Amino acid sequence: GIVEQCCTSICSLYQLENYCN
Amino acid sequence: GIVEQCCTSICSLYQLENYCN
Amino acid sequence: GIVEQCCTSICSLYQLENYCN
Amino acid sequence: GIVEQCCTSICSLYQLENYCN
Amino acid sequence: GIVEQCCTSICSLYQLENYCN
Amino acid sequence: GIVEQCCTSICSLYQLENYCN
Amino acid sequence: FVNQHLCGSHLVEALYLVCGERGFFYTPKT
Amino acid sequence: FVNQHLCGSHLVEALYLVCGERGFFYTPKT
Amino acid sequence: FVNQHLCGSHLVEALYLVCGERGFFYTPKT
Amino acid sequence: FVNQHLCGSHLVEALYLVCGERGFFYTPKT
Amino acid sequence: FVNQHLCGSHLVEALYLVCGERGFFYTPKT
Amino acid sequence: FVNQHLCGSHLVEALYLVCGERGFFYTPKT
Ligand SMILES: [Sr+2]
Ligand SMILES: [Sr+2]
Protein backbone atom coordinates (compact mmCIF):
# COMPACT_ATOMS: atom_id res chain seq x y z
CA GLY A 1 0.00 0.00 0.00
CA ILE A 2 1.05 3.66 0.31
CA VAL A 3 3.60 2.80 3.14
CA GLU A 4 5.30 0.25 0.94
CA GLN A 5 5.17 2.51 -2.15
CA CYS A 6 6.28 5.81 -0.52
CA CYS A 7 7.98 5.02 2.80
CA THR A 8 9.65 1.58 2.53
CA SER A 9 10.28 2.27 -1.16
CA ILE A 10 10.23 5.83 -2.68
CA CYS A 11 7.53 7.52 -4.69
CA SER A 12 6.91 10.55 -6.84
CA LEU A 13 4.39 13.34 -6.08
CA TYR A 14 2.51 11.96 -9.10
CA GLN A 15 2.29 8.58 -7.41
CA LEU A 16 0.94 10.36 -4.29
CA GLU A 17 -1.94 11.70 -6.38
CA ASN A 18 -3.14 8.06 -6.54
CA TYR A 19 -4.43 8.56 -2.96
CA CYS A 20 -6.42 11.75 -3.59
CA ASN A 21 -10.24 11.50 -3.31
CA GLY B 1 -17.75 19.34 7.91
CA ILE B 2 -14.82 18.56 10.33
CA VAL B 3 -12.20 20.27 8.15
CA GLU B 4 -14.18 23.50 8.30
CA GLN B 5 -15.27 23.22 11.97
CA CYS B 6 -11.68 22.73 13.43
CA CYS B 7 -10.40 25.77 11.54
CA THR B 8 -13.25 28.29 11.93
CA SER B 9 -14.50 27.15 15.31
CA ILE B 10 -12.75 24.42 17.45
CA CYS B 11 -12.87 20.64 17.63
CA SER B 12 -11.89 17.84 20.00
CA LEU B 13 -9.61 14.87 19.48
CA TYR B 14 -12.74 12.82 20.09
CA GLN B 15 -14.55 14.42 17.05
CA LEU B 16 -11.44 13.68 14.94
CA GLU B 17 -11.57 9.99 15.84
CA ASN B 18 -14.70 9.80 13.73
CA TYR B 19 -12.51 10.17 10.57
CA CYS B 20 -10.32 7.24 11.42
CA ASN B 21 -10.60 4.16 9.26
CA GLY C 1 11.39 8.92 30.80
CA ILE C 2 9.11 10.15 27.99
CA VAL C 3 11.74 9.19 25.28
CA GLU C 4 11.87 5.63 26.55
CA GLN C 5 8.06 5.44 26.99
CA CYS C 6 7.00 7.06 23.67
CA CYS C 7 9.95 6.97 21.26
CA THR C 8 12.09 3.89 22.07
CA SER C 9 8.91 2.06 23.12
CA ILE C 10 5.37 3.20 22.03
CA CYS C 11 2.77 5.08 24.00
CA SER C 12 -0.86 6.07 23.90
CA LEU C 13 -2.19 9.66 23.78
CA TYR C 14 -3.44 8.93 27.30
CA GLN C 15 0.10 8.16 28.40
CA LEU C 16 1.18 11.49 26.83
CA GLU C 17 -1.25 13.29 29.14
CA ASN C 18 1.13 12.24 31.97
CA TYR C 19 3.42 15.10 30.81
CA CYS C 20 0.80 17.86 30.81
CA ASN C 21 1.20 20.63 33.43
CA GLY D 1 8.39 37.23 -5.04
CA ILE D 2 7.27 33.56 -4.47
CA VAL D 3 7.51 33.78 -0.67
CA GLU D 4 5.07 36.69 -0.69
CA GLN D 5 2.77 35.36 -3.44
CA CYS D 6 2.09 31.89 -1.78
CA CYS D 7 1.17 33.55 1.51
CA THR D 8 -0.91 36.57 0.40
CA SER D 9 -2.39 35.06 -2.72
CA ILE D 10 -1.89 31.36 -3.78
CA CYS D 11 0.73 29.43 -5.71
CA SER D 12 1.12 26.08 -7.48
CA LEU D 13 3.62 23.30 -6.93
CA TYR D 14 4.72 24.08 -10.48
CA GLN D 15 5.66 27.73 -9.55
CA LEU D 16 7.62 26.35 -6.56
CA GLU D 17 9.68 24.09 -8.82
CA ASN D 18 11.29 27.24 -10.14
CA TYR D 19 13.18 27.60 -6.79
CA CYS D 20 14.71 24.17 -6.99
CA ASN D 21 18.43 23.95 -7.54
CA GLY E 1 4.11 35.28 28.86
CA ILE E 2 6.39 33.89 26.04
CA VAL E 3 3.61 31.84 24.43
CA GLU E 4 1.54 34.98 24.01
CA GLN E 5 4.41 37.33 23.08
CA CYS E 6 5.79 35.16 20.14
CA CYS E 7 2.33 34.89 18.60
CA THR E 8 0.92 38.42 19.04
CA SER E 9 4.17 40.32 18.81
CA ILE E 10 7.58 38.66 17.98
CA CYS E 11 10.30 36.91 19.96
CA SER E 12 13.94 35.88 19.58
CA LEU E 13 15.56 32.48 19.84
CA TYR E 14 17.43 34.00 22.77
CA GLN E 15 14.13 34.72 24.69
CA LEU E 16 13.06 31.10 23.99
CA GLU E 17 16.24 29.75 25.58
CA ASN E 18 14.85 30.94 28.88
CA TYR E 19 12.27 28.06 28.76
CA CYS E 20 14.88 25.39 28.38
CA ASN E 21 15.40 23.03 31.27
CA GLY F 1 27.74 19.49 2.90
CA ILE F 2 24.86 20.46 5.21
CA VAL F 3 23.52 16.80 5.26
CA GLU F 4 26.87 15.50 6.41
CA GLN F 5 27.36 18.37 8.92
CA CYS F 6 23.83 18.42 10.45
CA CYS F 7 22.10 15.12 9.67
CA THR F 8 24.78 12.38 9.42
CA SER F 9 26.82 14.24 12.05
CA ILE F 10 25.27 16.88 14.43
CA CYS F 11 25.44 20.64 14.24
CA SER F 12 24.73 23.73 16.27
CA LEU F 13 22.20 26.46 15.35
CA TYR F 14 25.29 28.64 14.83
CA GLN F 15 26.59 26.19 12.25
CA LEU F 16 23.16 26.36 10.54
CA GLU F 17 23.64 30.11 10.10
CA ASN F 18 26.41 29.17 7.61
CA TYR F 19 23.59 28.41 5.11
CA CYS F 20 21.73 31.71 5.46
CA ASN F 21 21.75 34.04 2.41
CA PHE G 1 -7.41 16.00 26.13
CA VAL G 2 -8.19 19.62 25.24
CA ASN G 3 -10.09 21.30 22.40
CA GLN G 4 -8.31 22.32 19.24
CA HIS G 5 -8.04 25.14 16.75
CA LEU G 6 -6.71 23.42 13.61
CA CYS G 7 -6.30 24.76 10.05
CA GLY G 8 -4.59 23.32 6.95
CA SER G 9 -1.76 20.83 7.43
CA HIS G 10 -2.23 21.18 11.24
CA LEU G 11 -5.51 19.26 10.96
CA VAL G 12 -3.88 16.46 8.97
CA GLU G 13 -1.17 16.22 11.62
CA ALA G 14 -3.82 15.85 14.30
CA LEU G 15 -5.70 13.19 12.31
CA TYR G 16 -2.44 11.32 11.86
CA LEU G 17 -1.79 11.39 15.65
CA VAL G 18 -5.29 10.44 16.64
CA CYS G 19 -5.77 7.61 14.16
CA GLY G 20 -2.23 6.26 13.65
CA GLU G 21 -2.12 2.84 12.08
CA ARG G 22 -5.86 2.82 11.54
CA GLY G 23 -5.41 5.55 8.93
CA PHE G 24 -8.00 8.25 8.24
CA PHE G 25 -9.94 10.06 5.52
CA TYR G 26 -9.34 13.76 4.94
CA THR G 27 -12.49 15.26 3.44
CA PRO G 28 -12.72 19.10 3.07
CA LYS G 29 -15.78 20.91 1.74
CA THR G 30 -15.67 22.01 -1.89
CA PHE H 1 17.14 13.19 -9.23
CA VAL H 2 16.24 9.95 -7.35
CA ASN H 3 13.09 10.22 -5.18
CA GLN H 4 12.55 10.57 -1.44
CA HIS H 5 11.27 8.44 1.44
CA LEU H 6 8.00 9.76 2.99
CA CYS H 7 6.96 8.23 6.27
CA GLY H 8 4.37 8.85 9.00
CA SER H 9 3.37 12.45 9.41
CA HIS H 10 5.62 13.48 6.55
CA LEU H 11 3.74 11.25 4.19
CA VAL H 12 0.40 12.73 5.33
CA GLU H 13 1.81 16.25 5.00
CA ALA H 14 2.75 15.38 1.37
CA LEU H 15 -0.71 13.97 0.65
CA TYR H 16 -2.22 17.18 1.92
CA LEU H 17 0.12 19.25 -0.38
CA VAL H 18 -0.62 17.18 -3.51
CA CYS H 19 -4.38 16.62 -2.89
CA GLY H 20 -5.57 19.74 -0.94
CA GLU H 21 -9.29 20.43 -1.45
CA ARG H 22 -9.84 17.10 -3.30
CA GLY H 23 -8.99 15.52 0.07
CA PHE H 24 -7.32 12.13 0.46
CA PHE H 25 -7.22 8.82 2.33
CA TYR H 26 -4.28 7.61 4.42
CA THR H 27 -4.72 3.79 4.79
CA PRO H 28 -1.41 2.23 5.95
CA LYS H 29 -3.10 -1.14 6.71
CA THR H 30 -3.86 -1.39 3.01
CA PHE I 1 -4.49 -1.14 16.66
CA VAL I 2 -0.90 -1.25 18.05
CA ASN I 3 0.53 2.18 19.00
CA GLN I 4 3.03 4.49 17.31
CA HIS I 5 6.60 5.68 17.87
CA LEU I 6 6.85 9.44 18.66
CA CYS I 7 10.30 10.95 18.54
CA GLY I 8 11.90 14.41 18.64
CA SER I 9 9.75 17.15 17.23
CA HIS I 10 6.94 14.71 16.56
CA LEU I 11 6.75 13.85 20.20
CA VAL I 12 6.60 17.56 21.15
CA GLU I 13 3.94 18.16 18.49
CA ALA I 14 1.88 15.35 20.12
CA LEU I 15 2.34 16.82 23.59
CA TYR I 16 1.09 20.12 22.30
CA LEU I 17 -2.03 18.41 20.75
CA VAL I 18 -2.89 16.44 23.91
CA CYS I 19 -2.03 19.17 26.49
CA GLY I 20 -2.72 22.52 24.69
CA GLU I 21 -3.53 25.34 27.13
CA ARG I 22 -2.61 23.19 30.19
CA GLY I 23 0.92 23.34 28.76
CA PHE I 24 3.51 20.59 29.21
CA PHE I 25 7.13 19.71 29.95
CA TYR I 26 9.46 17.93 27.52
CA THR I 27 12.33 16.49 29.65
CA PRO I 28 14.23 13.84 27.62
CA LYS I 29 17.09 13.72 30.18
CA THR I 30 14.57 12.42 32.69
CA PHE J 1 -1.79 18.86 -8.13
CA VAL J 2 -3.79 21.70 -6.56
CA ASN J 3 -3.05 25.35 -5.76
CA GLN J 4 -1.63 26.32 -2.40
CA HIS J 5 -1.97 28.88 0.35
CA LEU J 6 1.43 28.76 2.08
CA CYS J 7 2.90 31.03 4.79
CA GLY J 8 6.06 30.77 6.92
CA SER J 9 7.52 27.33 7.59
CA HIS J 10 4.65 25.81 5.51
CA LEU J 11 6.26 27.22 2.35
CA VAL J 12 9.65 25.75 3.24
CA GLU J 13 7.98 22.38 3.79
CA ALA J 14 6.42 22.59 0.33
CA LEU J 15 9.74 23.57 -1.28
CA TYR J 16 11.39 20.64 0.45
CA LEU J 17 8.72 18.22 -0.92
CA VAL J 18 8.76 19.61 -4.42
CA CYS J 19 12.52 19.82 -4.85
CA GLY J 20 13.82 16.99 -2.64
CA GLU J 21 17.38 16.00 -3.37
CA ARG J 22 17.80 18.83 -5.84
CA GLY J 23 17.61 21.29 -2.94
CA PHE J 24 16.15 24.78 -3.23
CA PHE J 25 16.71 28.46 -2.44
CA TYR J 26 14.42 30.23 0.00
CA THR J 27 14.39 33.93 -0.86
CA PRO J 28 11.85 36.22 0.94
CA LYS J 29 11.48 39.93 0.21
CA THR J 30 13.17 42.33 2.62
CA PHE K 1 19.64 34.55 14.41
CA VAL K 2 16.52 36.54 13.49
CA ASN K 3 13.32 37.45 15.33
CA GLN K 4 10.29 35.20 15.14
CA HIS K 5 6.55 35.28 14.70
CA LEU K 6 5.42 31.99 16.27
CA CYS K 7 1.89 30.71 17.05
CA GLY K 8 0.60 27.29 18.18
CA SER K 9 2.62 24.20 17.32
CA HIS K 10 5.17 26.49 15.55
CA LEU K 11 6.31 27.77 18.96
CA VAL K 12 6.75 24.24 20.31
CA GLU K 13 8.83 23.39 17.25
CA ALA K 14 11.06 26.38 17.93
CA LEU K 15 11.44 25.46 21.62
CA TYR K 16 12.36 21.94 20.59
CA LEU K 17 15.08 23.26 18.21
CA VAL K 18 16.47 25.79 20.63
CA CYS K 19 16.59 23.55 23.69
CA GLY K 20 17.11 20.06 22.22
CA GLU K 21 18.30 17.52 24.73
CA ARG K 22 17.94 19.97 27.58
CA GLY K 23 14.17 19.81 27.14
CA PHE K 24 11.85 22.74 27.84
CA PHE K 25 8.63 23.80 29.57
CA TYR K 26 5.68 24.97 27.50
CA THR K 27 3.59 27.32 29.62
CA PRO K 28 0.70 29.26 27.94
CA LYS K 29 -1.48 31.78 29.75
CA THR K 30 -4.89 30.57 30.91
CA PHE L 1 24.38 19.35 26.17
CA VAL L 2 25.45 17.33 23.07
CA ASN L 3 23.79 18.47 19.81
CA GLN L 4 20.96 17.04 17.70
CA HIS L 5 20.53 15.32 14.35
CA LEU L 6 18.54 17.40 11.80
CA CYS L 7 17.40 15.61 8.69
CA GLY L 8 15.09 16.25 5.71
CA SER L 9 12.21 18.54 6.45
CA HIS L 10 13.41 19.03 10.01
CA LEU L 11 16.66 20.43 8.77
CA VAL L 12 14.82 22.86 6.45
CA GLU L 13 12.49 23.85 9.28
CA ALA L 14 15.61 24.69 11.37
CA LEU L 15 17.15 26.71 8.55
CA TYR L 16 13.96 28.69 8.31
CA LEU L 17 14.02 29.37 12.13
CA VAL L 18 17.68 30.47 12.18
CA CYS L 19 17.70 32.42 8.86
CA GLY L 20 14.10 33.78 8.47
CA GLU L 21 13.97 36.94 6.32
CA ARG L 22 17.67 36.60 5.29
CA GLY L 23 16.49 33.45 3.50
CA PHE L 24 18.67 30.38 2.95
CA PHE L 25 19.79 27.66 0.55
CA TYR L 26 19.21 23.93 1.10
CA THR L 27 21.73 22.11 -1.18
CA PRO L 28 22.04 18.45 -0.07
CA LYS L 29 23.97 17.49 -3.25
CA THR L 30 26.71 19.83 -2.08
SR1 LIG M 1 0.92 26.80 10.69
SR1 LIG N 1 10.26 13.44 11.11
Swiss-Prot record, chains G, H, I, J, K, L:
Organism encoding this protein: Homo sapiens
Outcome reported for the amino acid change (mutating F24S): In HPRI; Los-Angeles
Residues of the full protein shown: 25 to 54 of 110
Protein name per UniProt: Insulin B chain
